[PDB]
Write a protein that binds this ligand. Structure first.
Ligand SMILES: [Mg+2]
Ligand SMILES: [Mg+2]
Ligand SMILES: [Mg+2]
Ligand SMILES: [Mg+2]
Ligand SMILES: [Mg+2]
Ligand SMILES: [Mg+2]
Ligand SMILES: [Mg+2]
Ligand SMILES: [Mg+2]
Lengths: 559, 195, 559, 48
DNA sequence: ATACCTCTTGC
DNA sequence: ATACCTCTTGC
DNA sequence: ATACCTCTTGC
DNA sequence: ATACCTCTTGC
DNA sequence: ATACCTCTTGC
């Protein structure tokens, strides 16, 4: 029935028991420079809460949903894999929402034309630790001398696990607390699994072989980073980090192979208004002057005519490939979009995000179903397979069935397939763009692969750091023991129930550039209205939510 | 959900409905999120036709690969496309005393797990309604062009802007060490004969 | 039902109540220098836990398992001895495992050729003390003003008790806490005990005489070291210590007397492959040219021929000798090894380690039986007695039974004995090596004897400090009293239940040298594989273990 | 070239001799010689 | 033109 | 802030 | 350590 | 006080 | 008197 004793505070220049060590700031600054450059500084802070780990051990676990895949035709459902599980927790902040609110986004997006990522740093403070002790009256006392541990993997020794890919970054609301996630990482494993269908006879091999001892790697924080111990008075801070990576644009393109170059001169123009009064080239398709890449005909049509190269490309879908560890969907860059979609035509390439209350779902809404959406980029660089086709070289037309392959004809005798599903047109002439950011649920920057050769882009984030990326930040509560402890014993050790709270504050800097009017007509711009109006404000209860928004609004020539 | 005792059957469990999990995919239609669905930043390795022979002005020739294969599902017998094979005489490794003019040989199987296991591949209809119907899926089993011993994986290709991979590794002692680059305007990102 | 009061923290430059005083680091550094020297720096930290002593007294206890020895034929089982028991606890860290993990070991061992011990220092911090107070609800409160005591025997006044000899050093896992052991030391005593056998009639004298007052020595910390008192804010640190001792090699030898020098020229060579096509010297054994140490014959054989000196030596076993205080096994240097062993032939010289979870045994395994092993060095410098023999000087052969003594003939009329059991061949020509390290359970360095003349080596560790060795570190909880205390009273004093936790961190430095290829064939190297693969990783539960590994892998000429 | 350094807790793969291959590295009683092939990228590295 | 199984008892 | 059982590997 | 809804009544 | 799996983007 | 959709490859 004691308060513990209240203990007394000694005082240095950067801290003590009853001395704050930090300052809260989650404010965003725009600073206009000469020539239309802007320096955007975004501050962000949060109160973070964290419990002691389940157990102070590292574990090696295997996951096995064999049963589900055992089904036949449920290949895609495979979740098998191995992983190391640590006692540490990770503080990840890589995600649009952590840093900006809508108002901000708006601005950026409407007035700028390109954006560069500059630097970033973070710090922790006002640390606090309390212990619970318990008729179920729970009491809480500060444990003045206990500690919080912190480690920053600046060397990037640990494997990299961006958490946004699972919606586990921090929260997006400055005024409400949040937490870090428990850290874990992939551990190697061999695995086989033969695809099958409903109609498939017997049991296609489906097994977990084990682990290529060659491929083994087991890391630990303890052995690789220096751990800091903070007490309340303590505080920690990373330096400032600078990024090396390309800029990101905020404009989208729209021309496709069809709109490149000099359109054909029309010998004949309409003479009155009306949406049926077309113009006419006025020349026999087989009599026109110009250039093609087709040696046989004399036809020259908007679809035949030569273009300098090729925007976009086509690839297989839905493709699953498989290697040593099981199958996985083959990614695309492009996505699709347009008039012939409307989220329902929604296909391959468009990404889809799913998430919780901490990241956008309405706070007050009950029921644990995740909120979702499919981002549909503005950039018209994807494909409409249905429109594709292939024909015989003789090119005698109108064309015969025997000389043409359609998205309609079935391949391999399977009805619901056609060449477009296994087609691929990437090649030296291909040209395209990087994905666009996705607010607020998009990852912001990402690490590059350590392969000898490399992707030309990643699909999860727009900024890929060329060199090293900022090291991960882990934390964890220091074990607080009871008076009984026998390491020699097999049992798990008992600890005092302990937990901690601390504030975290970060600063992320971008640099961008104002855009300027070039066309006569105005352009698209994000804006509020009666329809969405409520998405941007709390409910009479404090309901909040963050809807997704687009990024590359304005157009730009492609050529 | 974690296991509570040792034993190679005590798996852990995510503990969430596959169609209820949070996260990201590159698939606009479902709500499924599985280790195979989930989005990855890009793609290691690629898949290519085999055994492919192409032909130009001077005759046909095998189309080369970078990757090779390897792993648990091989053991030199599964040995396929990509793995290189060296053959040679006494001056270069074959036992000096051994008589008989048959060359000694081997197939180098790299350690780097960057190749493909075609059998495992598959393709399905966009509607992605599953478990899947035969009509909506193409397998390494179904025969293409009406030829039994063929399937899409033989003419498939997945190289693309997202692809990522490594250079071959050296091969002692029979590997070439360095090599000249082609005088074309555009160039290979690597050669397969030397590092 | 109070929290004690929580007390308030004052602040100096090196500490306070809510100020951390240390940094956790258990990381290992390799720093490559010019000429292939490396500086290996190994850091290591632990959370140490410690309870108040059973009693604040020094006691003088005698141990007596008379009964067991009383048996007859159970001489070896004698455990008698005297000892002082202190209230202090000892922090010992002298043991391979404290400092390196396997990964490390690997490296070292595969790429280096010799290793030197350089310096070492340690420190303690983030001290904490709590008190337990108690329906059995135990509550824990910090006692802000209580203290921890610490003493460092830099003068080496206390008798030296390396704890690894009993597996009581600290733990080997950075991520799990551990503890110090209770300190005690031998106290002199006189004792007699006549060996006997099963078949032995009556009661062989078997007694504890007492104590040669001459030989008496009783030390106390208090009277010999300065004790520091740390409070939470306090922290302590030893200087840095430098070792003076020989290097240790990481290569083993293999030639025996048989492989020294110029082999005999073969006048006749094989002409085809096959493991039966031997070569032939081609000269009558009694007609060859060369040198022996045998004046009588003319025989010259690989076993007769003279060698420059003698590798290895032979000694009695199993020998027990006895002096003033009872019997004890006579130690050997060599051990044995090879083809004719396989842990089952395992004899005299090979050492055997036994230990708990804190030191390698599987953490999850239940049941208090110790894990064990017998280290079998790679260096081929031991003997195979069975092979030995002795013969009459006349050397007329083939030899007669009357002229030869075998490992088979029984000595003293005892069946199960032969000369080799009491044999000894050490002598001026003998040559040999130091023991090799034993990871992870081996002691690392050891003190030298204060005798006028000295051992040429120790068997428990490879590094013996020539001068002084780093002083022992003791700690102990300061008595925390109740309000009642009467020193004048005979009863034991009552104390508040108190205990403490603190982190300890050390740094140990070696310096080594890279090795280089010299032979055509590759050599042995430690490596992982399917078979051992799991020894190096945690179980799905957090099971851990550390298997033993070898040290002198590569070979080296001996001559 | 550049020396490598330990980073994981577990040791890694390493080329080594043993009873099985032992003879590949030495001449026969006749002078038989041979050179077997060996691997090159033994150790692992994160890819990401 | 020999230095402790390389270069290198060099520099 | 460890030197050969003190102070004191100081001075 | 408050300046006209940011940074910034700074520089 | 984060740099490309150590020390060490140090010196 | 042409520089990457302005002024402005200026200053
Ligand atoms: Mg650093
Ligand atoms: Mg570094
Ligand atoms: Mg393997
Ligand atoms: Mg592998
Ligand atoms: Mg002193
Ligand atoms: Mg002294
Ligand atoms: Mg006497
Ligand atoms: Mg005496």
């Amino acid at each position: 029935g004691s308060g513990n004793g209240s203990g007394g505070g000694g005082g240095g220049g950067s801290g003590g028991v009853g001395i704050s060590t930090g300052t809260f700031n989650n404010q965003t600054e725009f600073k206009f420079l000469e020539n239309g450059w802007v320096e955007i500084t975004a501050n962000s802070s949060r109160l973070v809460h964290l419990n002691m780990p389940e157990s102070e051990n590292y574990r090696r676990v295997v996951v096995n949903n064999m049963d589900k895949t055992a089904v036949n035709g449920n290949m895609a459902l495979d979740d098998i894999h191995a992983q190391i599980v640590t006692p540490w927790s990770l503080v990840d902040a890589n995600a649009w929402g952590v840093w900006f609110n809508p108002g901000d986004w708006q601005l950026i997006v409407n007035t700028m034309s390109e954006l560069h990522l500059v630097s970033f740093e973070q710090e922790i403070f006002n640390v606090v630790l309390k212990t619970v002790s318990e008729p179920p009256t729970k009491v809480y006392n500060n444990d003045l001398t206990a500690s919080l541990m912190v480690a920053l993997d600046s060397n990037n020794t640990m494997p990299f696990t961006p958490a946004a890919m699972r919606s586990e970054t921090l929260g997006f609301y400055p005024w409400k607390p949040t937490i870090p996630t428990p850290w874990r990482y992939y551990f190697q494993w061999d695995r086989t699994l033969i695809p099958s269908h409903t109609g498939t006879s017997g049991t296609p091999t489906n097994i977990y072989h084990g682990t290529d001892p060659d491929d083994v790697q087991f890391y630990t924080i303890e052995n690789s980073v220096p751990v800091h111990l903070l007490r309340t008075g303590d505080e920690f801070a990373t330096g400032t980090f600078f990024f090396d990576c390309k800029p990101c644009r905020l404009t989208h393109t729209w021309q496709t192979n069809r709109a490149l170059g000099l359109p054909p001169f029309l010998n004949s123009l309409p003479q009155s208004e009306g949406a049926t009064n077309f113009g006419d080239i006025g020349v026999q398709q087989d009599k026109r002057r110009g250039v093609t890449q087709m040696g046989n005909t004399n036809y020259i049509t908007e679809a035949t005519i030569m273009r300098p190269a090729e925007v976009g490309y086509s690839a297989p879908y839905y493709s699953f490939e498989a290697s040593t560890q099981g199958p996985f969907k083959t990614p695309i860059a492009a996505g699709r979009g347009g008039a012939q979609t409307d989220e329902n035509q929604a296909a391959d390439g468009n990404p889809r995000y799913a998430f919780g209350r901490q990241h956008g779902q309405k706070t007050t809404t009950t029921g644990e179903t995740p909120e979702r959406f499919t981002y549909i980029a503005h950039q018209d660089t994807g494909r409409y397979p249905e429109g594709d086709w292939i024909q015989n070289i003789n090119f005698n037309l109108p064309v015969t069935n025997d000389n043409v392959l359609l998205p309609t004809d079935p391949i391999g005798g399977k009805t619901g397939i056609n060449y477009t599903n296994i087609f691929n047109t990437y090649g030296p002439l291909t040209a395209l763009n990087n994905v666009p950011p996705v607010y607020p649920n998009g990852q912001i920057w990402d690490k590059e692969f350590d392969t000898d050769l490399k992707p030309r882009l990643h699909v999860n984030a727009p900024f890929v750091c060329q060199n090293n990326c900022p090291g991960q930040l882990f934390v964890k509560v220091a074990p607080n023991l009871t008076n009984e402890y026998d390491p020699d014993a097999s049992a798990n050790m008992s600890r005092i129930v302990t937990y901690s709270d601390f504030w975290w504050k970060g600063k992320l800097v971008f640099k961008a550039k104002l855009r300027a009017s070039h066309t006569w007509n105005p352009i698209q711009q994000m804006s509020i209205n009666v329809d969405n109006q409520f998405n941007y404000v709390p409910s009479n209860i404090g309901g909040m939510k963050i809807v997704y928004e687009k990024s590359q609004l304005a157009p730009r020539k492609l050529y």
